[PDB]
Each structure stands twice: as structure tokens, then as C-alpha cells.
């Protein structure tokens, strides 16, 4: 897994309510969260499939 899978989730400073997925390094699984639409981190994927591929093992 790339380093970014271990970055904590970050909604950002924008006020949008956008559904995205992040690898919860604690529960060790991809989960859903709400991105504001701006200035987050790399632990932010548009689909759960993508996330499971890169961070879980797909």
C-alpha cells in the first residue's frame, strides 16, 4: 500500500457535502466520509472499489 493509505481523513475547509471513501487505518478498511470539495489529502478516492484496490488489496 502506498504511504497515502495511512493519512488520516480530511474533509477540508470547503462546505460541500461530497461522498468519498478513505482507508480507515484503525478499523483497517475503506469507509465512507464527506469531503468539502477542496484541500484534502490523497486518502480520498471517488469509489469504494478504487479504495479497496489501492489500500485494501484489489
Amino acid at each position: 500500500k502506498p504511504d497515502f493509505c495511512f493519512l488520516e481523513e480530511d474533509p477540508g475547509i470547503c462546505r460541500g457535502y461530497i461522498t468519498r471513501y478513505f482507508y480507515n487505518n484503525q478499523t483497517k478498511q475503506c469507509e465512507r466520509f464527506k469531503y468539502g470539495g477542496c484541500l484534502g489529502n490523497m486518502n480520498n478516492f471517488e469509489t469504494l472499489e478504487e479504495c479497496k484496490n489501492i489500500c485494501e488489496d484489489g
Partner: protein, 223 residues
């Protein structure tokens, strides 16, 4: 909207919900076939929900119209958030009157102290999370560029205005983006960003709509 109150059903005829399967952003109907929103709320496919109140129940007054064209500002900066404005053209003219109405563009910019109304289906909790099914309203005054710039050193462009209360408690929050800030019957702001929600000395920063009237008129009148 944090620290606000539930608006009377269909009390904000110009407020629209942006949908791509669920509610992600807000907006305002400026004319029967164009909706103003924020650039960071961009998506390839978007449906505009007009006449809404309770976004979770089909109440019968709503109009579901799809976007025909989506135009973000040429100079939108994804980092500084400068020029956070976007125009959406509806594929069919909205049937206007009473529960669905347009908002007027600014004839002059608003001066600090002017009282406005901010509405949206965003988070109501400054600490935890809580999303209302019903439309929330908030009355807040435009802050001075001085206070805004001191609140956010190095981060305020001339295309942004702080609206809110330095003592916190009231503010817009996640889910409100693209939403309307109307003062004296004119659209003056678009919910953009802010460090957290309702935090002390961290008011909400909005796109200064008066800096784009000419661009808006031209784009509409040529699309």
C-alpha cells in the same frame, strides 16, 4: 446552517438543491433557466431540485430539472479558492411563481454591517454532526474587510467577504456550499469556505457576488 432556525416552508423560493444522487451542494435561481453556485461544487452530471423543503420526502411542490451546461469561472483557483463561482444552465425553464422564484443580482456591493440571510441543508452542529431534512435559515451581517483579513491573514482576496459573528455559535457548515447570502433583496454571497464551523474568530468566507455581475450577464446572454 449552525445556530439557525427552520425556515417556513417555501419561504426562500430562490433556494435550490444540487443533486447527483444525494444532496451535495446548494444554489440560487437567478433567472428561470440559470442557477448560480460555487465552482468547487462542480460535477459532470447535476440535477437541480427547485421548490424543496424537506429533501427526504416527495412533498409535491418540487421541480426536478437537469443541467444542460455547467460553467465554472475561468480563473477558479483550487488552492486559494479565488473566484469560487459557477453557473448552471437548466435543460428546461423552471416554472416560476410563489414557491419557485429568482433572486436579484447586486446593484451595488454590500457594505459592512448590512444584514443578510443565509440558507441551506448543511450541518447544524459546530462540534458533532447533524444534518437537517428541513431548510435552515440564519441572519448574519457582512463583516469588514479588516476583521476578515485579520481572521485569515494572507488568505483573503478582494473577491471574498466574511459574513458571520466573530463570537461564533452561528455560521454555515458542510452541505451549504453554493448556497445564498441575500441582503436587501439582492444576492451578495455564495457559501464558500471557512476554518471549521461556527468557531470563534473564524467567520464564514463567501464569494463576493458583486465582483461578477458583468461576467454573469455576459455568460448567460451568450449561452
Amino acid at each position: 446552517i449552525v445556530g439557525g432556525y427552520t425556515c417556513a416552508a417555501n419561504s426562500i423560493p430562490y433556494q435550490v438543491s444540487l443533486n447527483s444522487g444525494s444532496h451535495f451542494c446548494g444554489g440560487s435561481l437567478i433567472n428561470s433557466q440559470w442557477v448560480v453556485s460555487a465552482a468547487h461544487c462542480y460535477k459532470s452530471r447535476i440535477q437541480v431540485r427547485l421548490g424543496e423543503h424537506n429533501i427526504d420526502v416527495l412533498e409535491g411542490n418540487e421541480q426536478f430539472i437537469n443541467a444542460a451546461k455547467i460553467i465554472t469561472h475561468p480563473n477558479f483557483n483550487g488552492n486559494t479558492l479565488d473566484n469560487d463561482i459557477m453557473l448552471i444552465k437548466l435543460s428546461s425553464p423552471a416554472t416560476l411563481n410563489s414557491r419557485v422564484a429568482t433572486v436579484s443580482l447586486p446593484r451595488s456591493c454590500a457594505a459592512a454591517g448590512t444584514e443578510c440571510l443565509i440558507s441551506g441543508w448543511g450541518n447544524t452542529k459546530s462540534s458533532g454532526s447533524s444534518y437537517p431534512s428541513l431548510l435552515q435559515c440564519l441572519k448574519a451581517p457582512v463583516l469588514s474587510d479588516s476583521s476578515c483579513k485579520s481572521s485569515y491573514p494572507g488568505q483573503i482576496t478582494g473577491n471574498m467577504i466574511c459574513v458571520g459573528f466573530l463570537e461564533g455559535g452561528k455560521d454555515s457548515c458542510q452541505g451549504d456550499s453554493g448556497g445564498p447570502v441575500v441582503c436587501n433583496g439582492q444576492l451578495q454571497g455564495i457559501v464558500s469556505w471557512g476554518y471549521g464551523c461556527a468557531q470563534k474568530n473564524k467567520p464564514g468566507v463567501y464569494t463576493k457576488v458583486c465582483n461578477y455581475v458583468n461576467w454573469i450577464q455576459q455568460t448567460i446572454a451568450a449561452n
